[PDB]
Structure 1
Amino acid sequence: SLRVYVTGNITVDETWSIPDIPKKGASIHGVKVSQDIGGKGANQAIILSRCGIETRLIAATGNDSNGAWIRQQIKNEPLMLLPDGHFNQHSDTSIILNSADGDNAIITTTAAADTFSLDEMIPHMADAVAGDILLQQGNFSLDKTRALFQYARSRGMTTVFNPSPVNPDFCHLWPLIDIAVVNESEAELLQPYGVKTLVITQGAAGAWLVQEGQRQFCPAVPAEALDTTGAGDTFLAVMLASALLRGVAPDALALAHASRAAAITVSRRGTLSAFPGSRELAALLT
């Protein structure tokens, strides 16, 4: 019965296949092979909703084709996307998949998130109550991010923070955070301190649960790294859902469930079509 409010972003990740990245002045032919709903905010909110946690995703969409697509595709998930309607412009990433070329090149836009204001968001947490969670990633400016956590604090909400993309100035918000989820680089760069619950993820190398002075390690679940997209979002969402469903603060079992869920995501390609499904989640959380 505790609910989760996620204030972050939502995008369209477009996978384009090309022989090689074109040089300036060049013009080539390519293939728009696929599109998937993306964004750390949306991925985390969607997976949380699939675990049976009543979740509200507060993110902005624009008035373009990708916007309508997002609003249409999100209806397939047991999540509520606020606000309805839209703004203008539109977050998404073009994933340039080359041929002989090794790694992909990524170009990402953030206009919708950068413009989404506090007066647009706060109203959608009007029905929040003490105990409810405000989950935030690193898609907003320091001022907006800090302001949202202060709002949560003034309502008695629990604050969860996953500072990714990283922002050096995020190292000042720790006092406003109840639960921190960071990967290795983030843990060393932001130096989270005094956070009552600290989780440090290290990919296929497992994760650490830290803070009642106690340090606990949870190995990753062996898996075929076919596509790691959203592995971190999966881990965070399931860890939180597990703790919520059992009525406790994140613990060792929460991390074990999360590792198991992330293992599924890594084994499948894409986002929504790769993440564990509601029944798969029900089974592992059991």
Structure 2
Amino acid sequence: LIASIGELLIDLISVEEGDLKDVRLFEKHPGGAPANVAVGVSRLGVKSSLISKVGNDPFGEYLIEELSKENVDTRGIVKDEKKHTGIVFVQLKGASPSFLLYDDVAYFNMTLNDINWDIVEEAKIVNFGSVILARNPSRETVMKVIKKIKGSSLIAFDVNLRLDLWRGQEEEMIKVLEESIKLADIVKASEEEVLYLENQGVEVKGSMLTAITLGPKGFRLIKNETVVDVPSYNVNPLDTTGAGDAFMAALLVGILKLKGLDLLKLGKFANLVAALSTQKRGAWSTPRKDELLKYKEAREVL
């Protein structure tokens, strides 16, 4: 029903605060925006699959197992015999969070052969990554997939901009992103990204819907000429790490379930799911359907 295609990797999360240079301990967890959204969609009660590529190693097996536990279809996840599973060391704490991502990994080495078309086509909504586009052959491969299915399925794109991933090739970045946006019916981006990109002559807009996140403050929806600000519900945030992908998961589930872009319904659903997710720890903080039924906002969609 809903399929995601993009980076699937291991997050080595710093246990203590400090620069990556000084951090002594790391805790491993499954990561990758597309995979995080795929799990969120699954927890919302919607069948979901992930098309990605991991290495034929212990980390690869771990990721497939963890996704399997969340009920995400992994049949579309290929194992690479040359490249090892993706990894990124992260420091989520402090005033200036940082990361060290290793790019010669399996998810950046996808080829058309690696794509399971039966799955990408059965889906009503196809969500693809921005990070996955920083390196070929995955870039070419993904752009080819999105262009091919366009029109047959709704396309969703989260800008999720990472400048460090395009150093020395920013021009190409502008092209790839602009091209991606133009293919997406549903586009998600933080206000910062929106600003940074328009300042490059790039319009951050989805042909069907645009969702601009405004941090803990809230989000904003744009339908044609209609602009709606949605303040965030009150919560005593435990961890907002997964808020972005939880928000995206809810947004794609809401669109799927609600015939007619009722931004009021949709807006309330995403706000609810995103806010509540700040109660869970980690990259997969999307609340389960069984927990959202108590709310009228969710009952509408779910």
User: 1:54 offset after TM fit, Å?
Assistant: 1.6
Q: What is the CA–CA distance in structure 1 between the aligned matches of 2:89 and 2:254, rounded to whole Å?
A: 33
Q: Give SS of 1:224's match.
A: coil
Residue 148 of structure 1 aligns to which amino acid in structure 2?
Answer: V
Partner of 1:48: 41
Question: Counterpart of 2:49 in structure 1: which amino acid?
Answer: R
Q: Deviations over 1:183-215 (max 9, x none)?
A: 112222142247231111111121111133111
Equivalent position SS for 2:132: coil
Superposition deviation, residue 18 in structure 1: 5.5
Q: Which runs of 5+ in 2 are unaligned?
A: 134-138, 163-172
8 Å Cα contact 2:78/2:114 also seen in 1 = no
CA distance in structure 1 between the partners assigned to 2:37 and 2:17 by the alignment: 33
**What residue number does 1:186 align with?**
193
Aligned: 1:176 with 2:183 = yes
Match of 2:165 in 1: none
Alignment partner for residue 128 of structure 1, among 108, 113, 122? Answer: 122
Which residue in 1 is equivalent to 2:76?
83
Does the CA-based 8 Å contact 1:18-1:97 persist in structure 2?
Answer: no
Please state whether the residue corresponding to 2:246 is helix, strand or coil. helix
Q: How much does 1:10 deviate?
A: 1.4
Deviation at 1:219, TM superposition (A): 0.9
Task: Label 1:227 to 1:247 Cα distance change in 2 as closer, same or farther (>3 A).
Answer: same
The 3 A distance-change label for structure 1 pair 29 and 164 is closer
Following the alignment from structure 2 to structure 1, what is the Cα–Cα distance between the partners of residues 121 and 141? 20
Deviations 1:65-92 (A, max 9, x none): 2112112222211210133561140112
The count of aligned residue pairs is 273
Cα pair 2:44 2:287 within 8 Å, conserved: no
Matched ranges for 1:120-269 at <5 A: 120-125=114-119, 127-128=121-122, 132-141=124-133, 143-153=140-150, 156-165=152-161, 167-169=173-175, 170-188=177-195, 189=197, 190-193=202-205, 195-249=207-261, 251-269=263-281
Judged with a 3 Å threshold, the aligned counterparts in structure 2 of structure 1 residues 97 and 184 are, in CA distance, closer, same or farther, namely closer
CA contact 1:13–1:94 (8 Å) conserved in 2: yes
Instruction: Give the whole-Å Cα distance in 2 for the aligned partners of 1:176 and 1:164.
Output: 16
Q: Post-superposition shift, 1:105?
A: 3.8
Name the % identity. 21
AA aligned to 1:277 is R
Contact 1:17 1:97 (8 Å CA) reproduced? no
- Structure 1 letter corresponding to 2:153: M
The offset of 1:278, in angstroms, is 3.2
Give ranges in structure 1 of 5+ residues lacking alignment. Answer: none
Q: For residue 251 of structure 2, give the secondary structure of its aligned residue in structure 1.
A: helix
For 2:112 and 2:9, how far apart are their aligned partners in 1?
A: 19
The Cα shift of 1:19 comes to: 7.7
Q: Hey, which bits of structure 1, 4+ residues long, moved more than 6 A?
A: none
Matches of 1:29 and 1:79, distance apart in 2: 32
| Contact in 2 for aligned 1:51/1:282 (Cα 8 Å) | no
Question: Hey, what's the Cα distance between the residues in 2 that align with 1:177 and 1:275?
Answer: 23
CA RMSD in angstroms, aligned pairs only: 2.6
Distance in structure 2 (CA, Å) of the matches to 1:148 and 1:262: 29
Written as runs of structure 1 = structure 2, the 5 A alignment for 1:30-69 is: 30-32=24-26, 34-69=27-62
Distance in 2 (CA, whole Å) between partners of 1:30 and 1:121 is: 38
Q: 1:38 to 1:173 in 2, by over 3 A?
A: closer
Check conservation: 1:203, 1:220, Cα contact below 8 A: no
Shift in alpha-carbon separation, 1:178–1:250, aligned structure 2, 3 A: farther
Q: Residues 206, 96 of structure 1: CA spacing in aligned structure 2 closer, same or farther, 3 A cutoff? A: closer
Would you say the 8 A contact 1:240–1:254 is kept in 2? Answer: no
1:5 touches 1:134 (CA, 8 Å); kept in 2?
A: yes
Q: Report the alpha carbon displacement of residue 29 of structure 1 after superposing the two structures with TM.
A: 8.5
Q: 2:57 and 2:262 mapped to 1: Cα distance?
A: 40
Q: 1:22 to 1:183 in 2, by over 3 A?
A: closer
Post-superposition Cα deviations, 1:213-258, rounded to whole Å, max 9, x if no partner, equal 1111111122333322121100011121122222333622212111
Distance 1:19 1:207 in 2: 29
Q: 1:119 to 1:183 in 2, by over 3 A?
A: same
**CA displacement 1:136-169 (0-9 Å, x = unmatched):** 1202335344322211116x11111112235422
